[PDB]
Amino acid sequence: RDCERFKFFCPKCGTENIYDNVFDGSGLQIEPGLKRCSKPECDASPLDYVIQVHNKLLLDIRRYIKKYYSGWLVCEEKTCQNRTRRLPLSFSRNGPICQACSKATLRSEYPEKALYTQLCFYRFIFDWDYALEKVVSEQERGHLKKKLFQESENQYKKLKSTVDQVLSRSGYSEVNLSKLFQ
Amino acid sequence: QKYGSRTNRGEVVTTYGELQGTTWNGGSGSNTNVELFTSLDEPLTKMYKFMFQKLMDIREVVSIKIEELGASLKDHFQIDEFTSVSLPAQETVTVLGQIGCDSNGKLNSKSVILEGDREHSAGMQVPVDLSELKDYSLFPGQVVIMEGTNSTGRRFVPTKLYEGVPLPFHQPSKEFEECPQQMVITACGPFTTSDTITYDALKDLIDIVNRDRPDICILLGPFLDAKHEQIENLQLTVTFEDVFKRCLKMIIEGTRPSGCHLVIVPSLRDVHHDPVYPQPPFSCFEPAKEDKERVHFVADPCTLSVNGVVIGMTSTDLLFHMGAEEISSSDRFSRILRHILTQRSYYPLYPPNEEINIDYEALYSYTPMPVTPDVFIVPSELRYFIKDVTGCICINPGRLTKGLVGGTYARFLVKSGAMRSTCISAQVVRV
Amino acid sequence: TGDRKGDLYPSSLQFYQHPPTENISLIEFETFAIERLKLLKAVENLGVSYVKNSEEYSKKLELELRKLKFPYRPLHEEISDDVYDLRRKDHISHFILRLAYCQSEDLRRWFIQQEMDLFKFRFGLLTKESVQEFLKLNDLQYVAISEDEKNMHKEDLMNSSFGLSLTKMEDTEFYKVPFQAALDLVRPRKVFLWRGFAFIPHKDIVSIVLNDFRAKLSKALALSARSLPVVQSDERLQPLLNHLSHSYIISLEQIDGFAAKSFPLCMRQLHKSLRENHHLRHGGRMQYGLFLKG
Ligand code: SF4
Ligand SMILES: [Zn+2]
Ligand SMILES: [Zn+2]
């Protein structure tokens, strides 16, 4: 619920398309989101410009990784709300001590969990199989489990491969069980 | 249009060392041995899982950096005891710490703070008053030792700033005593004009390589710039990986006649690669069986050994990053380069610039400078140069393309044991 | 054995002797911890509610194990990737819970009890072949006699085991155990002893196995409590482990409200009297009870 949705500008009409699920619509009128543009007057299919969708996905992933590695910290105290990029070596039991007030902890503005959830959401909005099993209903599942959507399924699998590749390189995020159990 | 009709082709914009003929020729990488500098620490040669940094780990890495550099400097200077930075000091005391800015802006003489390490100061900070220091040069993240007094317990007043101590140069073995001088052509991205994706400057440079037959060609990223106007606005009809693959094929296949060892260094601006520093080597291209021994996909930063000559190189614009933060009492680039060499790290700036993503465990493991390099390639948006900083030849070849107009590259000659004149000659030349 | 598997998980049941050495994700850590906490709480609730030998206990425990996807049944097929995954789950989750359940003696006891119960159930679901496999993989060496030695002591074995027929005996294989483990059998002279070993045919054995298991587990928990300071410094895992034991995994009140509007005046009067005096004569009891049933 706190993750940004996938914004893609139609090459033809230039209208923003917000993607938050694999499938859009209800009943037999349900189709993959990237099949038709959000503008009724626009006949362009975003599935045609899947290279552009791939490029925008990579750019968005880069944007989120940059946001995470910016390392912005905010003081948890409402009356301080000090915002700094510098992590001080002075730590309390709860974490870095804010050097503006010297009495509250600095919390990451974009923690690792936020980035992990964003990447998981981008995977979710392209997970054909998961959407079919969980999100989609019975009649809708039947209508979507036929031909006329195999090409869309393949393109969605390719697009999910990108987010899967990125997540495969994420440590979140890593627990070294060797250090715990000795 | 503008690039293709340029008139200053081949102009030598900067020169250093022994004068050479108007034409340079190399051995085509015949009697050449290129490897990664074999130091105690293992090099970065494969991807490492990232995007998971614990604040405790960052604290530990920064603290151990300060502690290790301070230990080396204490042994070198025969300093007796370090004192906690935060505690008051009525008499003169020696304090080890790292410099920083009291606010988020750019450092100035009235915003300097010294943060101590965990061992001697529990990580405490103290404001610094530079009124009694006659000469200084400070940048954030700089590990320093200072003699000073803290009468109020609230403001440290330095009276002496200990100078930096660079690492010793490399003592080459005799195995390469009989090898000839080696020619190295180094160029840095971007390789295409701002309004094109055809890589015309790269084609010109490849023609130059085949013409001069250098022994090594060091190509630094970006190879598919993220700031390219076409890339940002999503006008490309092919995937990023495809464009990068085409570029690498062009480079490798086009250099076949020259037989030149190619050293490819990634850049943080490579839109197709992992955005993390230290950057792992490229791994999406498999050279043909006839080019495997010629292509070296190295990491950013890299310390290379070429017949015993140690070349340090980084794609990161270190000079631009540190020039925006360095404060001095009164050549600025020489000062920054000496700072880099004395801190013994390829990226001593903390916090980093806004354009670089730093994984601090990888930074700790793969940014220490093993020795002081004989040649240090530091491409920058700033002007090209060839400087001699503490016996190290620092070369900024500029960037091959500067917007719509063509840029510059560099060519230098290296021989182990020459005369310390390991760099016979060097030249920044126009494309 | 798809990509990164091995012989690390031969059998379903294990004594949990060797700690895991892998690098797992925080999400996987949390999922495994919570899932095994659910499994152990289900074990405890079923043990309180039902007799552990009861068929209801077995059915409900199998349902819970299937729901949480833990290894509970063998498979005479091979080490399928999915199976491997399940076993890995079990192995990691157990140790995670050890880290959670070693701080206080109370907690330790609770953990041990639940673990033992689970182990017993799983043993109860093991076919004789599988059982022997297990007893071998852990160097328990409870026999298995050769056929030649069996023929050598055929008559002794026949007279040792009660109600064993000649051919049926030929169809059975015995095990060799030190007599110190078969006390309950040797004491009433219902198993042959030869040279310090009892020859036990293919219910009590689980007991001995469990004893061994319990010993080991107690030792392990002690060691874990001794290695606690190294883990407390990892904030990520502190909220979980320090508090796992306290982790969450028509109404009577509205009746009064109904009495405001819906209740007919008779029931309103009865309810008012009941709340005024907390007691009703027999007629009121009958009327109000029947109405509340309605
Ligand atoms: S018995 Fe109750 S519901 Fe029936 S008429 Fe009397 S008050 Fe109304
Ligand atoms: Zn459109
Ligand atoms: Zn604060």
Short mmCIF file of C-alpha atoms in Angstrom, two decimals, chain B residues 63-224:
data_model
loop_
_atom_site.label_atom_id
_atom_site.label_comp_id
_atom_site.label_asym_id
_atom_site.label_seq_id
_atom_site.Cartn_x
_atom_site.Cartn_y
_atom_site.Cartn_z
CA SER B 63 35.22 3.40 12.36
CA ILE B 64 37.72 0.76 11.24
CA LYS B 65 38.78 2.98 8.33
CA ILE B 66 39.58 5.79 10.76
CA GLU B 67 41.26 3.40 13.20
CA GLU B 68 43.47 1.70 10.61
CA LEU B 69 44.64 4.90 8.96
CA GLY B 70 45.27 6.43 12.38
CA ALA B 71 47.29 3.40 13.46
CA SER B 72 49.50 3.64 10.38
CA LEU B 73 49.97 7.38 10.88
CA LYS B 74 50.70 6.93 14.59
CA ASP B 75 53.42 4.40 13.82
CA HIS B 76 54.85 6.70 11.15
CA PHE B 77 54.83 9.87 13.30
CA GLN B 78 55.77 8.19 16.60
CA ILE B 79 52.73 9.70 18.30
CA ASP B 80 52.46 8.55 21.91
CA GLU B 81 48.74 8.62 22.73
CA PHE B 82 45.51 9.70 21.10
CA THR B 83 42.91 11.52 23.18
CA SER B 84 39.13 11.46 23.01
CA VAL B 85 37.93 14.24 20.72
CA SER B 86 34.94 15.19 22.87
CA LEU B 87 36.70 15.53 26.22
CA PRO B 88 37.94 18.99 27.26
CA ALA B 89 41.66 19.68 26.90
CA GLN B 90 43.32 22.66 28.57
CA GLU B 91 46.77 21.61 27.31
CA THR B 92 47.71 20.51 23.82
CA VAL B 93 46.54 17.02 22.87
CA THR B 94 46.75 14.91 19.72
CA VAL B 95 43.39 13.77 18.34
CA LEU B 96 42.56 11.38 15.50
CA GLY B 97 39.33 11.78 13.61
CA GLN B 98 37.52 12.37 10.35
CA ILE B 99 36.33 15.70 8.99
CA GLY B 100 32.71 16.52 8.27
CA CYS B 101 30.23 19.33 7.81
CA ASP B 102 27.87 20.37 10.61
CA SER B 103 25.04 20.75 8.07
CA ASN B 104 23.87 19.24 4.79
CA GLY B 105 25.33 21.98 2.57
CA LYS B 106 28.87 22.30 1.25
CA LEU B 107 31.72 22.43 3.74
CA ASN B 108 33.14 25.80 4.74
CA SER B 109 35.71 26.90 7.30
CA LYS B 110 33.00 27.70 9.86
CA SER B 111 31.11 24.39 9.51
CA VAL B 112 33.89 21.86 10.17
CA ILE B 113 33.38 19.09 12.72
CA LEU B 114 35.74 16.31 13.75
CA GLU B 115 34.21 12.90 14.46
CA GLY B 116 36.33 10.45 16.39
CA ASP B 117 36.51 6.71 16.11
CA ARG B 118 34.86 4.23 18.45
CA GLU B 119 38.13 3.13 20.04
CA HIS B 120 39.34 6.52 21.27
CA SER B 121 36.24 8.74 21.28
CA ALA B 122 33.12 6.51 21.32
CA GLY B 123 32.21 8.08 17.98
CA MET B 124 31.68 11.54 19.47
CA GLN B 125 31.91 14.71 17.38
CA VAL B 126 33.29 18.15 18.17
CA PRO B 127 33.15 21.49 16.32
CA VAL B 128 36.48 22.69 14.95
CA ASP B 129 37.79 26.26 14.99
CA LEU B 130 40.33 26.84 12.21
CA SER B 131 41.44 30.30 13.37
CA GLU B 132 44.81 29.15 14.76
CA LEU B 133 45.69 26.88 11.80
CA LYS B 134 47.89 28.75 9.33
CA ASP B 135 47.69 26.22 6.47
CA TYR B 136 45.16 23.46 5.90
CA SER B 137 43.28 21.50 3.25
CA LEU B 138 40.24 19.57 4.47
CA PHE B 139 37.46 17.60 2.82
CA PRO B 140 34.64 15.59 4.42
CA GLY B 141 35.60 12.02 5.23
CA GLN B 142 39.28 12.92 5.53
CA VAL B 143 41.08 11.02 8.29
CA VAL B 144 43.31 13.52 10.10
CA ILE B 145 45.53 13.80 13.15
CA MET B 146 45.58 17.22 14.80
CA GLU B 147 47.32 18.78 17.77
CA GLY B 148 44.98 21.20 19.50
CA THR B 149 43.24 22.33 22.66
CA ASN B 150 39.62 22.27 23.83
CA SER B 151 39.35 24.75 26.68
CA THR B 152 35.55 25.05 26.69
CA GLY B 153 34.94 21.36 26.08
CA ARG B 154 32.71 22.44 23.19
CA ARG B 155 35.05 23.66 20.42
CA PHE B 156 38.31 22.04 19.34
CA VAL B 157 41.00 24.49 18.25
CA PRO B 158 43.65 22.77 16.11
CA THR B 159 47.18 24.13 16.18
CA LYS B 160 48.85 21.51 13.98
CA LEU B 161 47.42 19.41 11.15
CA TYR B 162 49.65 16.42 10.48
CA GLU B 163 50.46 15.87 6.82
CA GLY B 164 49.39 12.80 4.92
CA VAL B 165 51.68 9.83 4.36
CA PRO B 166 51.31 8.16 0.96
CA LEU B 167 51.93 4.47 0.56
CA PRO B 168 55.31 3.38 -0.82
CA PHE B 169 55.59 2.79 -4.54
CA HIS B 170 55.87 -0.70 -5.97
CA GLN B 171 59.30 -2.32 -6.15
CA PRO B 172 59.10 -4.25 -9.45
CA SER B 173 60.67 -7.66 -9.84
CA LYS B 174 63.37 -8.29 -12.42
CA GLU B 175 61.07 -10.61 -14.41
CA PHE B 176 60.10 -7.62 -16.60
CA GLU B 177 63.52 -5.94 -16.74
CA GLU B 178 64.04 -6.91 -20.39
CA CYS B 179 60.51 -6.11 -21.59
CA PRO B 180 60.17 -3.11 -23.94
CA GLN B 181 58.25 0.07 -23.26
CA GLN B 182 54.49 -0.38 -23.46
CA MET B 183 51.97 1.96 -25.11
CA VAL B 184 48.64 2.61 -23.40
CA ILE B 185 45.71 4.50 -24.94
CA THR B 186 43.08 5.47 -22.38
CA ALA B 187 39.65 6.93 -23.12
CA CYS B 188 36.57 7.61 -21.01
CA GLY B 189 32.90 7.86 -21.87
CA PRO B 190 30.53 9.12 -23.07
CA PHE B 191 31.47 7.61 -26.44
CA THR B 192 28.55 8.98 -28.49
CA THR B 193 27.40 12.50 -29.17
CA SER B 194 24.57 13.91 -27.08
CA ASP B 195 22.11 13.69 -29.99
CA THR B 196 23.25 10.39 -31.53
CA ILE B 197 23.51 6.73 -30.55
CA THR B 198 25.86 5.70 -33.35
CA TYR B 199 29.18 5.85 -31.43
CA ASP B 200 31.10 7.94 -33.94
CA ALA B 201 33.79 8.98 -31.48
CA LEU B 202 34.25 5.33 -30.56
CA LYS B 203 34.75 4.47 -34.23
CA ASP B 204 37.36 7.20 -34.57
CA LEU B 205 39.15 5.95 -31.45
CA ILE B 206 39.10 2.37 -32.75
CA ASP B 207 40.63 3.61 -36.00
CA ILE B 208 43.32 5.36 -33.97
CA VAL B 209 43.95 2.14 -32.03
CA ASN B 210 44.36 0.07 -35.18
CA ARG B 211 46.59 2.79 -36.65
CA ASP B 212 48.92 3.13 -33.66
CA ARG B 213 48.70 -0.48 -32.42
CA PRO B 214 48.95 0.23 -28.67
CA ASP B 215 49.76 -2.48 -26.16
CA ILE B 216 46.81 -1.67 -23.87
CA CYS B 217 43.55 0.20 -24.43
CA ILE B 218 41.80 1.27 -21.22
CA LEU B 219 38.16 2.16 -21.87
CA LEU B 220 36.24 3.67 -18.95
CA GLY B 221 32.49 4.03 -18.85
CA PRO B 222 29.81 5.03 -19.35
CA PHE B 223 29.25 2.99 -22.51
CA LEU B 224 25.46 3.52 -22.48
#
